[PDB]
């Protein structure tokens, strides 16, 4: 058998910025 | 058998910004 | 047998902004 | 047998903005 | 047998804005 | 049997910025 | 005393 | 005393 | 006393 | 007394 | 007294 | 005086997909 | 004086999809 | 004086889909 | 005086995908 | 008294 | 006087993917 | 006087992927 | 012969 | 012969 | 013969 | 013969 | 014969 | 004969 187990107990803050390109 | 288990117990804050491109 | 199990117990705040492009 | 189980017990706030493009 | 089970016990606030484009 | 186990108990802060290119 | 067998749903006892 | 067998739905006991 | 067998769902007892 | 056998889900007892 | 056998999920007892 | 001038003479194809999140 | 001038001479195809979330 | 001028000379095709959420 | 001038003469193809997160 | 056998998940007892 | 001039004469293909996170 | 001049005459292909994180 | 003075709009002559 | 002065609109001559 | 003075818009002559 | 003075816009002559 | 003075925009003559 | 004075933009003659 195959078992994928993910357990998260903490706060996560993710910020992603893509852009600001001048052509 | 195959078991995918996802467990999240914490606050998650995600911000994504795409754009601001001048052509 | 195959088992997909998703369990979320925490607050989630997601903000997505796409745009602001000048041509 | 195949079992998809989704369980959400927390508040979710999602904001999506698309637009603000000048041509 | 195949079982899709969705269970939501929390408040959900979704805001979507599309538009504000000048041509 | 094969077992993938991921356990996170700490706060995670990730910031990603891609862009700011002038052509 | 709560006994649950083959629980695929969400069970909430208070 | 709550006994549930083959529960695929949502059970809420208060 | 909480006894759970073959629990694939989410069980919340308070 | 909490006894869990073959628990693949999330169990929360408070 | 908490006894867990074959626990693949997340168990939280408080 | 202040002059904002935007001139677009080419075809623009924009595709945006937001979603497909399981909780 | 202040002058905002927008001029578009090309075809524009925009597709936006928001949704497909399971709770 | 203030002058907002918008001029569009090209075909525009916009498709927006919001929904398909299961709770 | 201040002059912002944007001139685009080429085809632009932008694809943005945000999502596919399992909690 | 906490007894855990074949624990592949995360167990948190407080 | 201040002059911002942007001139683009070439095809631009931008692809952005954000997501695919398991918690 | 101050003059910012950007001139692009070539094809640009940009691909950005952010994500695929397991917690 | 096309003469345009202070053109803020779009002028198309064919 | 097309002469336009202070054109803020769209002028189309064919 | 095309003469343009103070052109802030887009002029297209074909 | 194309003469342009103070051109801040886009001029296209074909 | 193309004469351009104080050209801040894009001029395309073909 | 192409004469350009104070060209800050892009000029393309073909």
UniProtKB/Swiss-Prot annotation, chains A, B, C, D, E, F, L, M, N, O, Q, R:
GO terms for biological process: amylin receptor 1 signaling pathway; amylin receptor 2 signaling pathway; amylin receptor 3 signaling pathway; amylin receptor signaling pathway; apoptotic process; bone resorption; cell-cell signaling; eating behavior. Its main location: secreted. It is found in: Secreted. Changing residue 1 to A/D/S: Promotes formation of fibrillar aggregates. Amyloid fibrils are degraded by insulin-degrading enzyme IDE. Amylin/IAPP is a glucoregulatory peptide hormone that plays an important role in the regulation of energy homeostasis. Selectively inhibits insulin-stimulated glucose utilization and glycogen deposition in muscle, while not affecting adipocyte glucose metabolism. IAPP function is mediated by the CALCR-RAMPs (AMYRs) receptor complexes. Amylin can also bind CALCR receptor in the absence of RAMPs, although it is more selective for AMYRs. Belongs to the calcitonin family. This is Islet amyloid polypeptide. The modification Tyrosine amide is found at residue 23. Can form homodimers. Interacts with IDE and INS. Interaction with INS inhibits homodimerization and fibril formation. GO terms for molecular function: amyloid-beta binding; hormone activity; identical protein binding; lipid binding; receptor ligand activity; signaling receptor binding. One of its GO terms (cellular component) is extracellular space. The chain holds residues 48 to 70 of 89 of the full protein. Keywords: Amidation, Amyloid, Cleavage on pair of basic residues, Disulfide bond, Hormone, Secreted, Signal. The mature protein is largely unstructured in the absence of a cognate ligand, and has a strong tendency to form fibrillar aggregates. Homodimerization may be the first step of amyloid formation. IAPP is the peptide subunit of amyloid found in pancreatic islets of type 2 diabetic patients and in insulinomas.
Swiss-Prot record, chains G, H, I, J, K, P, S, T, U, V, W, X:
It comes from the Eukaryota. It is found in: Secreted. Amyloid fibrils are degraded by insulin-degrading enzyme IDE. Belongs to the calcitonin family. Can form homodimers. Interacts with IDE and INS. Interaction with INS inhibits homodimerization and fibril formation. The mature protein is largely unstructured in the absence of a cognate ligand, and has a strong tendency to form fibrillar aggregates. Homodimerization may be the first step of amyloid formation. IAPP is the peptide subunit of amyloid found in pancreatic islets of type 2 diabetic patients and in insulinomas. This is Islet amyloid polypeptide.
């Amino acid at each position: 058998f195959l078992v994928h187990s993910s357990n998260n107990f903490g706060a996560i803050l993710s910020s992603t910025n893509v852009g600001s390109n001048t052509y």
